[PDB]
Scaffold this active site. Sequence first.
Site, PDB file in Angstrom:
ATOM      1  N   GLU A  98      -8.038  13.385 -25.775  1.00 35.99           N
ATOM      2  CA  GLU A  98      -7.671  13.567 -24.368  1.00 35.99           C
ATOM      3  C   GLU A  98      -8.895  13.578 -23.448  1.00 35.99           C
ATOM      4  O   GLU A  98      -8.894  12.968 -22.378  1.00 35.99           O
ATOM      5  CB  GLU A  98      -6.908  14.885 -24.178  1.00 35.99           C
ATOM      6  CG  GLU A  98      -5.491  14.824 -24.698  1.00 35.99           C
ATOM      7  CD  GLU A  98      -5.334  15.446 -26.069  1.00 35.99           C
ATOM      8  OE1 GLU A  98      -4.200  15.918 -26.335  1.00 35.99           O
ATOM      9  OE2 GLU A  98      -6.320  15.456 -26.871  1.00 35.99           O
ATOM     10  N   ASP A 119      -0.811  11.813 -25.784  1.00 35.82           N
ATOM     11  CA  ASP A 119      -1.313  11.652 -24.430  1.00 35.82           C
ATOM     12  C   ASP A 119      -2.750  11.128 -24.455  1.00 35.82           C
ATOM     13  O   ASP A 119      -3.134  10.366 -23.581  1.00 35.82           O
ATOM     14  CB  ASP A 119      -1.178  12.949 -23.621  1.00 35.82           C
ATOM     15  CG  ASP A 119      -1.981  14.073 -24.142  1.00 35.82           C
ATOM     16  OD1 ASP A 119      -2.307  14.150 -25.348  1.00 35.82           O
ATOM     17  OD2 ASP A 119      -2.308  14.941 -23.295  1.00 35.82           O
TER      18      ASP A 119
END
Length: 319
Positions: A35, A92
């Site tokens: 991330e 993500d």
Amino acid sequence: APDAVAQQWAIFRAKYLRPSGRVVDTGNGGESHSEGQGYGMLFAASAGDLASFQSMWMWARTNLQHTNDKLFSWRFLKGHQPPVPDKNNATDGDLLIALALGRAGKRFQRPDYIQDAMAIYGDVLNLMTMKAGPYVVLMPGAVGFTKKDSVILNLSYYVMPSLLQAFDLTADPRWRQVMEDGIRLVSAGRFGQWRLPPDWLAVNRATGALSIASGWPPRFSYDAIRVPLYFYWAHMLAPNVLADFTRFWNNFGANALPGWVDLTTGARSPYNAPPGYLAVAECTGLDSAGELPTLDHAPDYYSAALTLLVYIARAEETI
């Protein structure tokens, strides 16, 4: 301010980017994550900083990208024997890195970055989207989120602008239902008096019934805060959902936003949210001037990254 993103990126870079290309997204600096690389890459691409983008992407590809698929191991531990002992991915992170590469490919006229983005998207679609009840959902990672009776989703991992870019670059029709069901899940998967999405959502595989996942506190908090942001950014925040977020932000006001809210009791955190939540609120309903928080006042990495993410959303969403 047309150069606002570049100015905030300069602060983020100064604080968190090592010469190695690693983004230090923890206090002590011994950790890095997919991330963090993804956010940093997105910010550098958005600011037009090709040198930093190159450094961070080379670091992410060499240290976190898998060999048998194009997804990324979620965490790097400097000093630890195997630096990357857990190969599990965080969706993500995969989607932020792909988003950044598609953005960098266009901005810097780098066809290899476009190819790199498409290669990641192909694997996110094949390896991380599947059936749950009546929906095709996006899984949060390869391991740990599918149980016998249900699947666990993290709605904040629906990095909206990245799903749109995936369809634009690959033209794969499967992305359509993924995005459409994401909209349906945000609409229906909200709880409590404020009708907020949880950080973790459980979907019964048989019935499709939605509930707050049992393995984490039943809150809207550090992950779910990104849901209104990503959907606003992608021009896919439904009026009824925006209305509910607006009521929620205004119940508290700019000096009292909560870091978390328990969706079963209505209780809130005994502290105020970091400034990054204020930035999100300002773009999604909070009564304010719009004068976003700046990174020179960020209390930590988490707040800085979330705040800069809002600057990117604002720069792009406003056309």
